[PDB]
Amino acid sequence: GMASKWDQKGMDIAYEEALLGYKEGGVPIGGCLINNKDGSVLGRGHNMRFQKGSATLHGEISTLENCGRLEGKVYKDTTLYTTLSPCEMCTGAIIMYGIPRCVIGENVNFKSKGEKYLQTRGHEVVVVDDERCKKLMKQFIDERPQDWFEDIGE
Amino acid sequence: MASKWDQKGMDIAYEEALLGYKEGGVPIGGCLINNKDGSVLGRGHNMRFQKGSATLHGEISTLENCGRLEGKVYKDTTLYTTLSPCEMCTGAIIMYGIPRCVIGENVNFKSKGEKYLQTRGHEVVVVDDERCKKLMKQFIDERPQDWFEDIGE
Ligand SMILES: O=C1NC=C[C@@H](O)N1
Numbered sequence: 001g002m003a004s005k006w007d008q009k010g011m012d013i014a015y016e017e018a019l020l021g022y023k024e025g026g027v028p029i030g031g032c033l034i035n036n037k038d039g040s041v042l043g044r045g046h047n048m049r050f051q052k053g054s055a056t057l058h059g060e061i062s063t064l065e066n067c068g069r070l071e072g073k074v075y076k077d078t079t080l081y082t083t084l085s086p087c088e089m090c091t092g093a094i095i096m097y098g099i100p101r102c103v104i105g106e107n108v109n110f111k112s113k114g115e116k117y118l119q120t121r122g123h124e125v126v127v128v129d130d131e132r133c134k135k136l137m138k139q140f141i142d143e144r145p146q147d148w149f150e151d152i153g154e
Numbered sequence: 155m156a157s158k159w160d161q162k163g164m165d166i167a168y169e170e171a172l173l174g175y176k177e178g179g180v181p182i183g184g185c186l187i188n189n190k191d192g193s194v195l196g197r198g199h200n201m202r203f204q205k206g207s208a209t210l211h212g213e214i215s216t217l218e219n220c221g222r223l224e225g226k227v228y229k230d231t232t233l234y235t236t237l238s239p240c241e242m243c244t245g246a247i248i249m250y251g252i253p254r255c256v257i258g259e260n261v262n263f264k265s266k267g268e269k270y271l272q273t274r275g276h277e278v279v280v281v282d283d284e285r286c287k288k289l290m291k292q293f294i295d296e297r298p299q300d301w302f303e304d305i306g307e
Pocket residue numbers: 027029047057058059060084085086087088090151152
C-alpha cells in the first residue's frame with residue numbers, strides 16, 4: 001500500500017508507546033489508531049500482559065480498548081499503527097471493526113499469516129521496516145525469550 | 155467426533171450469557187475447558203456495557219479470565235461460545251492454538267471466522283442450542299443499535 005501523510009506521526013506514537021511499556025517491564029509493542037483525514041489520535045496503547053496479567057491485551061488490542069466504545073462508522077476511515085506485525089488475534093480485531101489500513105513498524109522479529117490475511121480480506125498493509133522498533137523488539141526476545149513465547153501462545 | 159464435556163461447557167457458557175444479560179450487557183458467554191480431565195480454566199461474558207470495553211467480547215473476556223498461561227496449556231482445550239465467533243475472537247482461537255470451538259448457534263450471527271477456523275485445521279461444532287438462540291435474538295430485537303456496535307456496524 002502507498003504511504004500516507006500521517007504515517008510518520010502514527011509510527012512515532014506507537015514506538016513511544018512501545019518504549020513506555022518497555023520501561024514498565026512489559027512486552028515492547030505499542031500502537032495507536034488515527035483518523036485518516038485530520039490525523040487525530042483516537043487512542044494509543046501498548047502490551048499490558050505483564051502490567052495487568054493480561055492474556056488478551058496485546059499492543060493492538062490495548063490500543064483499541066483505549067479508544068473506548070465507538071460507533072461502527074468511526075473505525076471505517078482510520079489507520080491502525082503497530083510497531084510489530086499483527087498476530088491472528090490482532091488481525092481479526094482490525095478485520096472485525098473494518099479498519100481499512102494497517103501500518104507495521106517491522107516484520108523481521110515476528111510475522112504471522114495475519115499480515116497476508118489482511119490483504120486477502122481487502123485491507124491495505126504497509127511495512128515501514130522501522131529500525132528503532134526492530135532493535136527494541138530484538139532486545140526483548142534475546143533477554144526474555146520465555147516471556148515472548150508466552151505472548152504468542154508458544 | 156464428540157467430546158464428552160460439550161454439554162458441560164455449553165451449559166456454563168449459557169449461564170454466563172444469562173449473567174451478562176442480567177447485568178444489562180450483550181448476552182454472550184463462554185468458558186475454556188481442558189480436554190483431558192475436563193477442568194474449567196475460565197469463564198466469562200461480553201463486558202462492553204459493564205466496562206465500556208470495545209474488545210471484551212464473550213470469547214475475549216473468557217480468555218482474559220483464564221489469566222496468563224503457558225502456550226501449551228491452550229493446545230488441548232475446547233473453547234465454548236454461545237454465538238459463532240467474530241473475526242477477532244476467531245483470531246484469538248487461532249493465535250493460542252485452541253484445537254476445538256463448540257458453538258451454541260450461528261443463526262443470529264456468523265462471520266467468515268467459522269470457515270476460516272476450519273481452513274486453519276480447527277474443529278468446529280455448531281450445537282444449535284435454542285436457549286442461546288432465543289436469548290440472543292431477544293437482545294437484538296430490543297437493542298439493535300447496541301448489537302451493531304458490538305460487531306462494528
Ligand atoms: O502485543 C503484541 N504481541 C504480539 C504480537 C502483536 O500482535 N502485539
